[PDB]
């Protein structure tokens, strides 16, 4: 029934329940990439040590994502969908990253300074130390591959230089600038190292995922990886709830997983990761 599904898709709506009051300030207009794309105020990231007196000051277009599909007693991982490579917000990004003690970044997008800077670089160059707001970041090397590079950067506060920190930026440079990759393998491998990594740093912060405007690529990237740990944590012979999963994600930041395509790359990436995980196991 047309209405049986409409009054079903209605309860799936939360944008009306959750307020996006902070991203709406005429003070954060430039702090945004898409006027329609904004972070829920509740699960949104608040730049810290700022000044309440300054209209727009502690705002960043990002949110805290959490897999509510796994238990707190089940060491599930932490992410941060977010907007990305916006020149007009690079120090906001490093304050977000610094204050959230994040060690691994997951840029699901290349550079697109197009004429100006749709997507601009927020790192230096190998052996290059750059300052960003109160923090200085140095590039210790990009360990590329055919699809995703990997720059080793150490971020330290201009105040404390002996307080060195190395964050792992896993940029993905093979995503269809106008679609979804024809193969999960890459990101499926991309997610592999990222996971093993974060897991290497005993007490690191959430995983800062993002693209231009952390929504489509960012949403897909989170749900696939999220789904990977449910299996990795619960099992292959466990029930997967992609639809229920993607929603749980949306209800945390609007826009996560925007198109139909990204909707399939997940069915592909998870049907593959599964049959390949059991293949390895020689699951007959």
């Amino acid at each position: 029934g047309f209405w049986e599904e409409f009054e079903s898709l209605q309860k799936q709506e939360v944008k009306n329940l959750h307020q996006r009051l902070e991203g709406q300030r005429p003070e954060n207009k430039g702090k945004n990439r898409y006027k329609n794309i904004l972070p829920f105020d509740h699960s949104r990231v608040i730049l810290q040590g700022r000044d309440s007196n300054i209209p727009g000051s502690d705002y960043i277009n990002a949110n805290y994502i959490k897999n509510q599909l796994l238990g707190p007693d089940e060491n599930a991982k932490t992410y941060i969908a977010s907007q990305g490579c916006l020149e007009a917000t690079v120090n906001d990004f490093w304050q977000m990253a610094w204050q959230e003690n994040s060690r691994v970044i997951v840029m699901t997008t290349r550079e697109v300074e197009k004429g100006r800077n749709k997507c601009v670089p927020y790192w230096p160059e190998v052996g290059m130390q750059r300052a960003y707001g109160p923090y200085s970041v140095t590039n210790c090397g990009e360990h590329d591959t055919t699809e995703y590079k990997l720059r080793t950067l150490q971020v330290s506060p201009l105040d404390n230089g002996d307080l060195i920190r190395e964050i792992w930026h896993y940029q993905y440079l093979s995503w269809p600038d106008h679609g979804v990759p024809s193969e999960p393998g890459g990101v499926l491998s991309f997610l592999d190292q990222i996971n093993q990594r974060q897991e290497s740093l005993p007490h690191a912060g959430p995983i800062i995922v993002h693209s231009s405007a952390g929504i489509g690529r960012t949403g897909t990237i989170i749900v696939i990886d999220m789904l990977m740990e449910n299996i990795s944590t619960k099992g292959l012979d466990c029930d997967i709830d992609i639809q229920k999963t993607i929603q749980m994600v949306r209800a945390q930041r609007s826009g996560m997983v925007q198109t139909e395509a990204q909707y399939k790359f997940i069915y592909v990436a998870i049907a593959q990761f599964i049959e390949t995980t059991k293949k390895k196991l020689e699951v007959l």
Binding site: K15, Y34, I37, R116, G255
Partner: peptide, 10 residues
């Protein structure tokens, strides 16, 4: 003029 396009959500 920092142009663009994109967004839609939930």
């Amino acid at each position: 003029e920092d142009t663009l396009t994109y967004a839609d959500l939930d």
